[PDB]
Point group: D2
Chain length 393, copies 4
């Protein structure tokens, strides 16, 4: 074994895979990072040697994007990954590939807003029936499967309610039923939970959130457990032209290296903040998978590795008015905006940042429902700011 | 009127719009170029001031992408534009927005391969009927329109045959029929043909090609004639997650500035190369709108402005094997690859299928993208290559 | 000869060199554009194979920067090129390499402000004597050469007066005198004049201006006629750590492709604008190498190929007050700012955008002296805006 | 105090400054990250409003670079910071600004190679006398100060020996002597040592190393304790044309956010690797501030905060050939290259010169940059490599 070779028969440990996975020094120059292939087209040597060097057009595939895809397939435990302009585009590509008119698709009722909206507002017009059910109980899913069900789409934890789905149990049901199991583990990251290890057929990620974790790029990823699934997604990406760009792939290859340490820090910070809010006289409920009153504590302890994540939610006593005063008074370092998973701590109120009382209520997004993405700042500053805002609420 | 203002009541001339349309110096700093908003989210000042600064999340809209969209809307003469990760995503978004199960869509039979394939192989599974017809006679279009027809999709010039479609007549037909006319004018560029000026309801562009013209970025654009259409596209883009990145948009804002002079040069070179090939004994036919042998020269002279474009095609005597030997022996500066519209001259023979000769792509059919190299190097390379055919 | 080879024994024509010079498809993937080597360090195969792949540290050299350097050396007719963070850094590196205390350096008295300032304010403290003389007459230079003269630094055309220097004649003198001839041909571009073809030893370029021509990047280049000179510059760049970045190199590799067509359009526009101003009753003098009253018309016709450039200057009747009203009233498309050579037409007043009357007068930068960089907009818009501003002056 | 404001009278804690220092949401859009001002010039509103928006030309200053400079000034506790294309340009600019013919400058004898070489081989031709001495005893510094001495240049820890300099004592010596103290704390990072807090007049940083920590960018920074010093540096940077690019500054603004957790991890790994090597029979000596065998452990415990850093060094028994065989057989995840401070673990043996052993770099001297990989992979690779020594 020489410098540049890995030791044979060794599987690199996890953090090493985050640092190096799917990437070796440039063969041509030894460049330690992958060069950015900011180019549209790739010259062919001859008609007979078409694609011999593996590339022809970046809408189809691109060397930088491919390096990122390989690293992501390694980190998530999948056969192959496909990288997309956004997480919404990865989601939409799954829905586009595996559903046809007359098909049934069970979706967690607490899915990300955008996922729900793309299902109801758009894909339903193709006479695809999306049924949104409670995924907390796996028997609910098992018995909601119909003969037209082709896809079961789980999310865990859920955006923003933080409800968990038992991925292993649902995967068990879907295998027995011969149904595709797709799971959106954006809130979890592979550091906390890898649905493909838990039996999922497909994982969808918004790399915008934690993969990036820097509020820098948009991106999506579809990680497939088999070559058939992977090739289907690959084909449809080429057709829908929603592939990720080389520059975004570079950014994400760079930010993935620190995902484990980032998520550890965010999660410790979030554990402390959730405990603080748990004791606060102005706070009505606190949802965080790591505090002992979490209603799905057992599933969390079963399913979450290392951490319980950077996301939490709470409710301020007083209702919408108090929540709004609180939001309007949360100071820096906090940011009042959308997105999550970033180094920068973010706070938002999903119910004021278009629908009706009863929907957001049945969903769990109450009127004072504040969603919180914890970053890597000093937790004492973050709690100072929350405490101030709360005294103002 | 002081420094930094456009004169009220005056309209910039064409090239000025390419340089400056949709962009002003940065209000905060005066930066002559718009900064790159390489950021995903935008901080809101309060709950009630939500969106007061115009942005929330870059998947929905981004300032750099918006400046490019304003430029493109100005260049193509439309109400609004939306920018996409690719031309194929733009096309797909039109299909997704304006078709439903049971609808009918007429598509030019000589469309870009990708368009034909996403229609026939994906959207057709939603029980959408795509009919491919010959758009060279607008009477065909008029006769083929059904009551379920929602979209007529033209492309002019066509890839790779360079067939032309009469955008104005087709638009009058669709207006009378209240059907949406979408035109893919990627091969023309707005510098030679603007379908919105000719009555098209929507324009689709692969900005990858000429807008970029540098082999650098991928991109797509949908330019909408009306606010209703543009709002629909915008909403669907947000739902599809196929918006263009801010970095890409910065690149394209940069490269658009030289589109007029780039296309002037490419078309000069293309005219010269077409005349050269028109005389070569190894060459069966030459297709370029700028030579008298062009079948649709009347429509060409009516519809094309400034130039006849950087794209041409030609047939080499001897069929597929001849074309292949030529390709294998085309020297630099030519590049054998995909893509078109670049400063780098590109040659390809898409053949290397009885529906090919129905789509007009024959055995020795060679599509040629003329760049801005010295035309003598390009012609000398072509002449050598042909000596090996 | 196969696809990917050039025809043997052919020298590619000029515009072809701008499009392709110093760049071939990526050997590894066939990528038509050079990949961006956004990386600091390059992995070595072994101790004995150190530098075998040619790179180790991007402060010293970088593959993207090297591609740009090769293209630039081709376009300018030099042995080798060295690319720098800015044009000021290239200039400073020349001054740093070839002057020592006690040395004499003749500089054109109408050099770029920054060049003059770095000479007087900084390098003079090393007891280097910079003598600034009129370069319009080559005999002035010949007879101003002293035994301590090591460097003759010409600029042509000059920023902003547009004075020309007879590069061939000065090169002749410097050869006979055994003195280094450096020429800053930023205003000219190699499309109009290549001092290395005219006998210069070194060419300095601010690639910020026309190489870029898009107001996008900063950059500098030093093109050396011999390997000795080139290696000296290379060493000193590594030591002073002012190399250009891979990303800026990519941008410039991309913008160089259109330099010929850009400069043709800018120059036609500038010829028209200079004629218009030549006829304008509010304009006192107009300087443009292309109009028939240019005082150095003969040298211009001798020395300029294809074009007379995008730069012009004029003076408004009325003095500083009229000039200021005019500047304050020039509308878009014009931009009131610094820089030049860009697609965007730019106007500025060097004498109000810190010194004294008599210096700016002896220099030629009069009080109403407006410098104009013409872009590629529609010339009718540009003349409309100038005419408006002038009616306002 | 509403959303978007810092509480008046409060000072952010350390890690918060790494995330947020010197940056606010974009006033125009609310963009949570500052846009990239990839532009050369800035449009002025009028002749008299010249510079009213703060910018004119990116060689002189640029908004992205300025936001990074504000962050860095906050992190290092200085009046101001200027950013440069590289660490070497920062060092060079200090030498250019503060030395003149006939001046004297004391420089640590175990400085980074580049610093020693730009002094001995370039600036010495301006009749500037550079004296290289042993900074481990501040009495040496005090005794070596001449009336022509203008700059004392310390570096702590030193590259590659990891010698420490007592920044506080040296600063007191230079204060009494009214000589400028510049400290290159590149190896320490402000997370472990901030020389400005210890009395240094100037800090120089290669942001290439830990500030970046990703092997991505080159960069330098000069942090000035006073406005006089900072204005001098700024003026000279404008004259030298060696400012940092806006894109680089964007990258570094990004990577700085994780510097604390990166360095925490690297130093944990480094402590474990040093303890491992301290026990290996093939290893002569191990140099890491965090083990009891460290000669300057008292100064280490006094001057280092939080961690003892990601850098270590060690000597392999058998000399140069042993070190070389080890290097040739260090496996992945290790990278054999230059640079340090990255998430990617890097190893090198700078030897492959009687002044080497005067500068303390022996035959089997191996400098090691510990990244954030799993320490077991790193130790296993080192153990194999050593089995081949
Ligand atoms: C944000 C999100 C998405 C959408 O991904 P984008 O990158 O914003 O398009 C999908 N799933 C979850 C859980 C998400 O949070
Ligand atoms: C290439 C092309 C497209 C597709 O655009 P992409 O950017 O490659 O996805 C659409 N129409 C035409 C005419 C095209 O040539
Ligand atoms: C602008 C200029 C320079 C300086 O180059 P920068 O890129 O601005 O540092 C040098 N010479 C001339 C003629 C110039 O115009
Ligand atoms: C590398 C280094 C430098 C030089 O910085 P660059 O960015 O490589 O130019 C200066 N000081 C130390 C300690 C260094 O290690």
């Amino acid at each position: 074994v020489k410098a540049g070779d890995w030791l044979p028969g060794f599987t690199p440990r996890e953090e090493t895979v985050y640092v190096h996975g799917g990437v070796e020094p440039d063969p041509l120059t030894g460049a330690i990072l992958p060069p950015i292939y900011q180019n549209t087209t790739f010259v062919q040597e001859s008609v007979e040697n078409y694609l011999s060097k593996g590339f022809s057009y970046s809408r189809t595939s691109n060397p930088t994007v491919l390096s990122l895809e390989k690293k992501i397939a390694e980190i998530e435990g999948g056969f192959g990954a496909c990288c997309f302009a956004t997480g919404m585009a990865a989601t939409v590509t799954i829905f586009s590939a595996f559903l046809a008119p007359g098909d049934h698709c069970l979706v967690t009722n607490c899915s990300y807003g955008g996922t729900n909206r793309c299902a109801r507002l758009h894909f339903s017009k193709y006479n695809i029936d999306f049924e949104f059910i409670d995924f907390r109980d796996p028997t609910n899913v098992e018995k909601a499967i119909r003969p037209q069900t082709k896809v079961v789409f789980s999310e865990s934890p859920c955006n923003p309610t933080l409800y968990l789905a038992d991925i292993e149990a649902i995967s068990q049901i879907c295998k027995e039923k011969k149904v595709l199991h797709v799971c959106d583990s954006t809130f979890a990251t592979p550091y906390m939970m890898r649905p493909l290890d838990l039996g999922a057929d497909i994982v969808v990620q918004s790399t915008t959130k934690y993969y990036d974790g820097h509020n820098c790029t948009l991106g999506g990823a579809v990680i497939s457990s088999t070559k058939e699934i992977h090739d289907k997604v690959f084909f449809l990406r080429n057709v829908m032209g929603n592939i990720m760009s080389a520059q975004t792939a570079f950014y994400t290859l760079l930010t993935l290296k620190t995902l484990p340490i980032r998520v550890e820090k965010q999660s410790a910070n979030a554990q402390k903040i959730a405990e603080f809010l748990s004791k606060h006289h102005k706070v009505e409920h606190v949802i965080y998978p790591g505090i002992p009153s979490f209603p799905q504590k057992e599933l969390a302890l079963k399913q979450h590795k290392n951490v319980h994540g950077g996301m939490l939610a709470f409710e301020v006593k007083g209702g919408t008015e108090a929540g709004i005063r609180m939001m309007n008074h949360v100071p820096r370092p906090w940011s009042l905006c959308e997105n999550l998973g970033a180094c920068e701590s973010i706070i938002t109120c999903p119910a004021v940042f278009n629908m009706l009382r009863e929907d957001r209520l049945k969903v769990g997004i109450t009127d004072g429902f504040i969603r919180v993405s914890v970053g890597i700042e000093d937790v004492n500053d973050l709690i100072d700011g929350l405490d101030y805002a709360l005294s103002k609420a």
